Amino acid sequence: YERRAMELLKVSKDKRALKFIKKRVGTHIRAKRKREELSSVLAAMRKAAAK
Amino acid sequence: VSRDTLYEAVREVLHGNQRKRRKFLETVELQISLKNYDPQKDKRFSGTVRLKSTPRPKFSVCVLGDQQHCDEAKAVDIPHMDIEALKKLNKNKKLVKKLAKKYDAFLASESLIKQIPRILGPGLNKAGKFPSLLTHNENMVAKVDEVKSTIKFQMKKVLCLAVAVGHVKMTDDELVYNIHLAVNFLVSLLKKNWQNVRALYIKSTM
RNA sequence: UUGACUCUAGUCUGGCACGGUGAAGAGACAUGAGAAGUGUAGAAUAAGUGGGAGGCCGCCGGUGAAAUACCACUACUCUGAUCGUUUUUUCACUGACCCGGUGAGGCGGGGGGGCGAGCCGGGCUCUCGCUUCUGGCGCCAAGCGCCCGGCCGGCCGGGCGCGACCCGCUCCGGGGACAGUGCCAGGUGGGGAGUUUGACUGGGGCGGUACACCUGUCAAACGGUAACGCAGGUGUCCUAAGGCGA
RNA sequence: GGUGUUGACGCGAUGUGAUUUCUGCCCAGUGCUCUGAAUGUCAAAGUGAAGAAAUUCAAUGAAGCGCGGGUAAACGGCGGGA
RNA sequence: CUAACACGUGCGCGAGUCGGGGGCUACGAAAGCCGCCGUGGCGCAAUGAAGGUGAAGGCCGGCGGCGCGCCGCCGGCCGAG
RNA sequence: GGCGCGCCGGGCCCGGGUCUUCCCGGAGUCGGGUUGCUUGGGAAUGCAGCCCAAAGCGGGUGGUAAACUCCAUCUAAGGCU
RNA sequence: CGCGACCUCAGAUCAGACGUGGCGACCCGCUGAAUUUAAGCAUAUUAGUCAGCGGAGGAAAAGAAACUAACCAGGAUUCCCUCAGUAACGGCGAGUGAACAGGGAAGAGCCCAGCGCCGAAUCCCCGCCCCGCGGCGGGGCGCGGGAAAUGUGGCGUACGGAAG
Ligand SMILES: [Mg+2]
Ligand SMILES: [Mg+2]
Ligand SMILES: [Mg+2]
Ligand SMILES: [Mg+2]
Ligand SMILES: [Mg+2]
Ligand SMILES: [Mg+2]
Ligand SMILES: [Mg+2]
Ligand SMILES: [Mg+2]
Ligand SMILES: [Mg+2]
Ligand SMILES: [Mg+2]
Ligand SMILES: [Mg+2]
Ligand SMILES: [Mg+2]
Ligand SMILES: [Mg+2]
Ligand SMILES: [Mg+2]
Ligand SMILES: [Mg+2]
Ligand SMILES: [Mg+2]
Ligand SMILES: [Mg+2]
Ligand SMILES: [Mg+2]
Ligand SMILES: [Mg+2]
Ligand SMILES: [Mg+2]
Ligand SMILES: [Mg+2]
Ligand SMILES: [Mg+2]
Ligand SMILES: [Mg+2]
Ligand SMILES: [Mg+2]
Ligand SMILES: [Mg+2]
Numbered sequence: 001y002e003r004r005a006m007e008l009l010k011v012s013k014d015k016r017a018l019k020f021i022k023k024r025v026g027t028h029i030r031a032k033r034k035r036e037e038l039s040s041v042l043a044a045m046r047k048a049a050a051k
Numbered sequence: 052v053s054r055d056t057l058y059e060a061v062r063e064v065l066h067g068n069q070r071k072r073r074k075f076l077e078t079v080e081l082q083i084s085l086k087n088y089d090p091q092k093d094k095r096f097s098g099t100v101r102l103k104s105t106p107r108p109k110f111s112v113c114v115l116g117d118q119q120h121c122d123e124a125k126a127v128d129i130p131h132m133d134i135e136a137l138k139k140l141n142k143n144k145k146l147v148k149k150l151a152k153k154y155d156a157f158l159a160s161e162s163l164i165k166q167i168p169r170i171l172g173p174g175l176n177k178a179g180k181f182p183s184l185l186t187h188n189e190n191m192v193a194k195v196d197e198v199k200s201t202i203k204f205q206m207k208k209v210l211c212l213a214v215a216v217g218h219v220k221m222t223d224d225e226l227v228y229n230i231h232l233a234v235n236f237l238v239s240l241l242k243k244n245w246q247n248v249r250a251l252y253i254k255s256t257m
Numbered sequence: 258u259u260g261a262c263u264c265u266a267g268u269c270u271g272g273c274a275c276g277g278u279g280a281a282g283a284g285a286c287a288u289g290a291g292a293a294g295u296g297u298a299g300a301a302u303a304a305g306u307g308g309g310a311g312g313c314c315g316c317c318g319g320u321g322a323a324a325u326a327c328c329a330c331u332a333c334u335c336u337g338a339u340c341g342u343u344u345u346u347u348c349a350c351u352g353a354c355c356c357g358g359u360g361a362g363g364c365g366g367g368g369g370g371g372c373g374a375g376c377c378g379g380g381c382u383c384u385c386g387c388u389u390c391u392g393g394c395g396c397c398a399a400g401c402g403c404c405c406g407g408c409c410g411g412c413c414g415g416g417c418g419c420g421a422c423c424c425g426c427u428c429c430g431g432g433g434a435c436a437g438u439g440c441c442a443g444g445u446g447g448g449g450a451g452u453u454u455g456a457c458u459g460g461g462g463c464g465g466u467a468c469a470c471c472u473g474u475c476a477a478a479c480g481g482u483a484a485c486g487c488a489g490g491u492g493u494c495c496u497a498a499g500g501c502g503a
Numbered sequence: 504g505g506u507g508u509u510g511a512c513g514c515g516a517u518g519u520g521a522u523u524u525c526u527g528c529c530c531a532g533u534g535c536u537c538u539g540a541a542u543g544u545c546a547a548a549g550u551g552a553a554g555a556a557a558u559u560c561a562a563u564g565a566a567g568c569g570c571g572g573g574u575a576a577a578c579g580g581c582g583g584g585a
Numbered sequence: 586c587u588a589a590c591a592c593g594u595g596c597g598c599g600a601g602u603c604g605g606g607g608g609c610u611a612c613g614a615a616a617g618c619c620g621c622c623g624u625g626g627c628g629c630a631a632u633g634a635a636g637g638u639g640a641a642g643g644c645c646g647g648c649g650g651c652g653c654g655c656c657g658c659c660g661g662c663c664g665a666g
Numbered sequence: 667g668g669c670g671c672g673c674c675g676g677g678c679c680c681g682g683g684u685c686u687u688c689c690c691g692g693a694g695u696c697g698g699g700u701u702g703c704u705u706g707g708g709a710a711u712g713c714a715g716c717c718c719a720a721a722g723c724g725g726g727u728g729g730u731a732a733a734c735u736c737c738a739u740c741u742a743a744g745g746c747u
Numbered sequence: 748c749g750c751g752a753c754c755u756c757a758g759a760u761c762a763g764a765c766g767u768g769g770c771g772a773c774c775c776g777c778u779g780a781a782u783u784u785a786a787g788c789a790u791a792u793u794a795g796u797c798a799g800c801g802g803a804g805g806a807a808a809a810g811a812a813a814c815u816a817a818c819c820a821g822g823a824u825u826c827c828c829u830c831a832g833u834a835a836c837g838g839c840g841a842g843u844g845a846a847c848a849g850g851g852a853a854g855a856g857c858c859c860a861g862c863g864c865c866g867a868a869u870c871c872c873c874g875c876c877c878c879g880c881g882g883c884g885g886g887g888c889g890c891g892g893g894a895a896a897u898g899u900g901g902c903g904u905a906c907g908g909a910a911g
């Protein structure tokens with residue numbers, strides 16, 4: 001579910017990714033926290049691809 | 052974003068100067084790409100930042116002073132502009148738009164904006180160019196230095212931004228402090244936080 | 258009992274999970290490369306934005322405009338194609354799962370050996386692997402080869418391998434990510450359950466409403482007054498058919 | 504698990520009731536069955552959009568209903584006036 | 586018979602009242618006592634859905650406000666139909 | 667039988683304050699959706715089945731669902747008394 | 748081919764133990780009605796009740812906060828008075844219906860896994876000697892066997908803790 005969420009974040013569908021995580025995780029606060037840690041993981045992937 | 056990434060980015064460019072070793076004035080530049088801000092909708096952003104860095108400093112100023120301005124502005128070697136010169140180039144308006152081509156940003160005193168809106172103010176605001184006010188402190192020492200680099204984060208219909216900060220030989224800590232305050236006020240001027248920007252990229256003019 | 262009311266085991270169908278493996282077909286995308294970025298004024302085919310002051314040996318001005326033009330990497334859109342993310346359809350795979358058979362008895366490759374086909378004794382491709390005139394018998398190894406023990410080349414007693422090929426990862430087959438189960442969802446559901454099936458009345462039922470109201474009579478000159486007494490009416494209609502004035 | 508130590512000359516569910524002679528008409532109704540593609544109808548889940556979210560809206564759309572064939576040795580039915 | 590309520594009557598105290606629960610000291614598992622054990626119940630206040638508010642007034646002296654004779658605010662007097 | 671006294675043998679050879687440096691937590695569980703039962707618990711108090719299924723300045727509670735934001739309060743999914 | 752380790756899994760009338768069943772007033776876990784009330788009846792009510800099933804003890808269960816609160820704040824559980832027939836639920840009909848705070852009975856707190864550091868520093872069993880033996884225990888000796896590194900013991904547990 002979080003691989004598909006990071007796919008939606010690479011496409012940058014943030015509202016769809018947040019609704020996807022809040023359906024398949026539970027509360028909206030947990031959805032926000034997991035969305036921002038997946039965005040952090042994806043930024044670290046972009047830095048790894050950069051340098 | 053964290054801090055060590057921009058530390059390593061500025062370190063990488065300050066030792067990667069040897070990629071070019073320019074024939075020009077050596078300086079870097081901030082550029083911003085962001086993800087889904089719609090252009091046709093309202094609540095666009097148009098915000099000046101106050102910056103005590105002056106990171107570019109090669110900058111050309113023209114001030115428009117009232118009384119108590121003349122020989123002191125000419126002794127700090129800033130051109131005094133007068134009502135006779137405003138009517139001199141208000142009889143035809145076209146040469147001061149090339150003065151927006153020579154000079155970037157002006158400065159004004161406090162009374163002249165009844166003389167200005169006759170024809171030439173709305174005629175020559177068509178460059179992004181209106182001269183900046185002073186206050187009743189009546190000082191030009193360092194007030195011109197901080198009213199330059201009041202950086203306009205201006206919204207356009209295009210989804211891209213570029214910020215004019217940084218040269219190669221200022222101090223490292225003051226430069227990372229500069230772009231620290233730059234990117235945090237830019238995120239705070241955006242409609243939402245760090246998700247709203249798609250890329251932070253710091254690389255240089257060449 | 259059913260066309261009553263409310264539901265029910267069962268059954269049909271959909272979704273989710275168990276539930277995986279490849280190859281094609283349609284994409285939607287991300288990504289690398291590639292080229293238009295043709296209003297007018299303007300040496301002009303100016304997409305936008307900010308930095309920008311000299312390489313190489315256009316330009317910083319100026320010209321017109323809403324808006325420039327060395328150089329750098331910025332993000333936008335449009336069109337062809339490479340690559341890897343997912344959805345979908347078909348064809349396969351088997352390993353979960355199911356079915357049958359047996360005392361789970363020779364499965365799959367390969368090696369060896371006979372019968373034909375065609376080339377110059379040869380190989381390749383293929384096939385076969387020993388039972389059909391008879392209401393018989395059929396096992397517990399003969400033969401071979403190599404070791405070994407006891408007694409005196411002779412006697413007696415043993416062991417191992419070919420005979421009965423080798424190697425393997427599911428016992429063989431047959432289905433297969435669907436049957437199926439677990440949980441929701443809709444349909445069907447007197448097979449089964451629980452219950453209901455008004456009142457008044459010259460017995461009850463059928464009829465009628467005398468069950469909520471209105472007029473005249475009853476009703477005996479205040480009011481009141483009964484029957485399934487009498488003659489009748491109502492569940493509406495009106496932007497005026499309400500309110501004034503003439 | 505029974506039929507089943509079974510396999511359409513069987514098992515299971517019906518009606519009618521030996522033999523002879525026949526077995527007429529009707530599929531409109533109620534059933535049963537066949538087909539899934541005109542407009543329909545259609546739950547949960549999935550999808551998309553709006554919104555700060557709960558939420559709302561939209562599209563897609565299984566069976567069954569509808570619609571369309573078959574069937575009376577299925578339940579049944581089979582006129583009137585001059 | 587137990588519980589709850591209502592009214593009437595008897596009794597104690599009375600804007601209070603009650604220890605029923607706890608504690609301290611044969612009949613007696615009774616009885617007495619607690620008071621800085623009245624916690625609490627009921628009563629002493631009502632109304633409102635709720636925010637909430639929450640049960641006399643008059644006269645005198647002073648400082649049309651005008652085409653607050655009313656009186657706004659301060660000092661005195663009478664005072665609870 | 668218990669409380670007292672003494673001997674032999676055996677076990678432990680234990681602590682408190684200050685400073686400095688380290689370290690710290692229970693997962694098919696919390697939670698969400700749906701369904702059923704229970705509850706005074708009412709946009710679901712608790713329990714369970716199925717599906718989804720975490721996080722670590724986190725998580726739960728804060729009696730009306732939800733989003734933003736300060737607070738307050740505890741530390742679940744281990745055990746004894 | 749054989750031998751030897753470990754892992755999974757069998758067979759023992761092996762050595763030593765343990766569980767089974769009964770009573771069941773009180774207690775714990777599950778299952779669970781209908782009479783009855785609603786002047787009918789279907790939601791409710793009877794009612795988490797009767798019946799059924801499993802499991803104990805001298806008491807069981809609970810129990811040291813993922814608590815109550817919103818105050819100047821209390822502080823495990825259990826029981827009594829009260830909160831209160833209140834808040835609330837309910838064809839909002841009949842009916843149902845707790846808790847907090849307060850006063851009392853009682854009063855007690857603790858231990859792991861984890862994070863670690865100490866040469867497994869830990870434990871069980873058999874043989875022999877001494878003592879005690881009708882609650883098989885205390886000490887010594889075995890180059891006796893075994894468990895355990897897939898983790899025993901010591902310190903340490905949210906009130907912080909460890910080491911120097
Ligand atoms: Mg019906
Ligand atoms: Mg039925
Ligand atoms: Mg019936
Ligand atoms: Mg009757
Ligand atoms: Mg009359
Ligand atoms: Mg009369
Ligand atoms: Mg028949
Ligand atoms: Mg028909
Ligand atoms: Mg009385
Ligand atoms: Mg039940
Ligand atoms: Mg129950
Ligand atoms: Mg109930
Ligand atoms: Mg609230
Ligand atoms: Mg809040
Ligand atoms: Mg704990
Ligand atoms: Mg606990
Ligand atoms: Mg034995
Ligand atoms: Mg027993
Ligand atoms: Mg009744
Ligand atoms: Mg009755
Ligand atoms: Mg009855
Ligand atoms: Mg009940
Ligand atoms: Mg019982
Ligand atoms: Mg006992
Ligand atoms: Mg106990």
Ligand SMILES: [Mg+2]
Nearest residue numbers: 746808809810
């Ligand atoms: Mg316990």
Ligand SMILES: [Mg+2]
Nearest residue numbers: 814815822847
């Ligand atoms: Mg309590």
Ligand SMILES: [Mg+2]
Nearest residue numbers: 626627831833
């Ligand atoms: Mg009371």
Ligand SMILES: [Mg+2]
Nearest residue numbers: 792794843844
């Ligand atoms: Mg009850």
Ligand SMILES: [Mg+2]
Nearest residue numbers: 846847848849
């Ligand atoms: Mg209490």
Ligand SMILES: [Mg+2]
Nearest residue numbers: 860898899900
């Ligand atoms: Mg340990």
Ligand SMILES: [Mg+2]
Nearest residue numbers: 741811812905
């Ligand atoms: Mg604790």
